[PDB]
Design an enzyme around this catalytic site. Structure first.
Site, mmCIF file in Angstrom:
data_model
loop_
_atom_site.group_PDB
_atom_site.id
_atom_site.type_symbol
_atom_site.label_atom_id
_atom_site.label_comp_id
_atom_site.label_asym_id
_atom_site.label_seq_id
_atom_site.Cartn_x
_atom_site.Cartn_y
_atom_site.Cartn_z
ATOM 1 N N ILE A 141 2.871 7.080 6.380
ATOM 2 C CA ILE A 141 4.207 7.175 6.967
ATOM 3 C C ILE A 141 5.215 6.959 5.882
ATOM 4 C CG2 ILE A 141 5.841 5.964 8.518
ATOM 5 C CD1 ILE A 141 2.202 6.570 9.283
ATOM 6 N N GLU A 152 -4.103 5.507 11.491
ATOM 7 C CA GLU A 152 -5.479 4.959 11.388
ATOM 8 C C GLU A 152 -6.405 5.518 12.469
ATOM 9 O OE1 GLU A 152 -6.140 3.765 8.624
ATOM 10 O OE2 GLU A 152 -4.900 2.083 7.987
ATOM 11 N N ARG A 193 -7.482 8.854 11.437
ATOM 12 C CA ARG A 193 -8.560 8.790 10.432
ATOM 13 C C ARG A 193 -9.901 8.443 10.911
ATOM 14 N NH1 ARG A 193 -4.153 5.411 7.398
ATOM 15 N NH2 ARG A 193 -3.356 6.809 5.825
HETATM 16 O O1 LIG Z 1 -0.049 2.429 2.172
HETATM 17 C C1 LIG Z 1 0.922 3.024 2.750
HETATM 18 C C2 LIG Z 1 2.164 3.277 2.123
HETATM 19 C C3 LIG Z 1 3.204 3.961 2.827
HETATM 20 N N1 LIG Z 1 2.939 4.322 4.091
HETATM 21 C C4 LIG Z 1 1.724 4.077 4.714
HETATM 22 O O2 LIG Z 1 1.530 4.487 5.925
HETATM 23 N N2 LIG Z 1 0.717 3.426 4.045
#
Ligand SMILES: O=c1cc[nH]c(=O)[nH]1
Ligand SMILES: *[C@@H]1O[C@H](CO)[C@@H](O)[C@H](O)[C@H]1NC(C)=O
Length: 246
Positions: free
Chosen positions: A71, A160, A163
């Protein structure tokens, strides 16, 4: 773009959103039948927009880097917000340009920094669909300490889950009651880059990981993943971070 509405949400509709999210990430090949995210994407095509709506129908748009499911930042009414990190500043060149105002959050987006900002580790932060409603609500109006916690919820319940099928199922189980992440959830989040790498190195090594990956399993016991026949690889992981970005 992809969208998700909390109002009327159930496990089925959340699984539809996670499917849409996965399907919006581009790939040119699969490695052991898992989509391989791209090494690089130029310009505005790098970023996927996720439209999220809380129970009351208020909305944020979240910008996601399609190479690594990170993100970058989000838009809430007419204000944009971005992590304080170079990849997010770059993103701010392409997305949410018509916001009246751009706020740089006072942290980067990795778990270690977000947990410092939030005042708690994510072992202690409940997640679920009600928690995602709360997070959206929090992000609508700036509060940087509140936002850190909201962002730990948002990252887990979108990226997550995209994933890992196990994490999607854990959120489904929390459709109407939040609960802190299982130890296995935390383990997987923390191992995505390592797993992505070992799965790609196993091509050329007969399916065998060059370095085994230590995880916590569904029963809370500490397993060791050595090759592509493991259920983590055959069933669970849904996207691979390209080794070019590791
Ligand atoms: O590790 C990170 C860094 C920026 N944004 C994310 O979602 N994860
Ligand atoms: C590969 O992994 C499987 C599944 O976890 C395990 O049973 C087996 O012992 C491993 N095999 C090799 C050749 O390393």
């Amino acid at each position: 773009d992809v969208s998700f509405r909390l109002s009327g949400a159930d496990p089925s509709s959340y699984g539809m959103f996670i499917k849409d999210l996965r399907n919006a990430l581009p790939h040119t090949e699969k490695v052991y039948n898992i989509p391989l995210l791209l090494p690089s994407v130029s310009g505005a095509g790098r970023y996927l927009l996720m439209h999220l709506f809380n129970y009351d129908g208020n909305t944020i748009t979240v910008a996601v880097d399609v190479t690594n499911v990170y993100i970058m930042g989000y838009l809430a009414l007419t204000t944009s917000y971005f992590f304080n990190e170079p990849a997010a500043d770059l993103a701010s060149q392409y997305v949410f340009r018509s916001a009246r105002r751009k706020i740089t959050l006072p942290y980067s987006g990795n778990y270690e920094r977000l947990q410092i900002a939030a005042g708690k580790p994510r072992e202690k932060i409940p997640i679920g669909l009600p928690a995602l409603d709360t997070a959206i609500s929090t992000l609508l109006h700036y509060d940087s300490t509140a936002a850190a916690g909201a962002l730990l919820v948002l990252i887990q319940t979108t990226a997550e889950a995209a994933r890992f099928k196990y994490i999607e199922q854990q959120i489904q189980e929390r459709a109407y009651r939040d609960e802190v992440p299982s130890s296995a959830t935390i383990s997987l989040e923390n191992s995505w880059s390592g797993l992505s790498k070992q799965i790609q190195l196993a091509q050329g090594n007969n399916g065998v990981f060059r370095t085994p990956t230590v995880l916590v399993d569904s029963k809370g016991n500490r397993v060791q993943i050595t090759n592509v026949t493991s259920n983590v690889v055959t069933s669970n992981i849904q996207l691979l971070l390209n080794t070019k970005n590791i």
